[PDB]
Amino acid sequence: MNPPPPETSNPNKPKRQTNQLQYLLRVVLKTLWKHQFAWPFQQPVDAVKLNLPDYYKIIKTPMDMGTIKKRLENNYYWNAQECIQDFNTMFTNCYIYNKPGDDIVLMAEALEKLFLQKINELPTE
């Protein structure tokens, strides 16, 4: 009932190492990954195990920090904006699927506030 996870490597997709992508792995992801609210976002939503049968009927662009971590580790991104877009997709999915008063929404809001603080101090290329 789960889709395959988002791709985290591609032999055809070009790759480079930049200080901005290094900052996103070493500072931004690392900060969010170890946060007390990170754990529901550390892997793709398992709709079977979590008993959320409608999840992938509603969310057609799934994204999670486990996938973002692998993409950064695998040099999948060419630029920082591709990675920032994936974080925004993850937060947006959470706000669309869940009810406004749900604890997962409060957890996502806390992580997004921390995320935007760290992106505000992104170093120049």
Positive or negative CA dihedral for 54, 86, 89, 102?
positive
Contact flags string 37-56 toward ligand QAZ, x per CB under 6 A: ---x----x----x------
Q: SS3 of 23, please?
A: helix
Positive or negative CA dihedral for 68, 69, 70, 75?
positive
Residues 55-84 that bind ligand QAZ (CB under 6 A): none
Beta carbon of residue 87, minimum distance to ligand QAZ (angstroms, whole number): 13
Beta carbon of residue 108, minimum distance to ligand QAZ (angstroms, whole number): 7
Binding part of the chain for ligand QAZ, among 14-22, 75-83, 102-110, 111-119 by CB under 6 A, reads 102-110
Question: What are the residues binding ligand QAZ (CB under 6 A)?
Answer: 40, 45, 50, 94, 97-98, 102-104
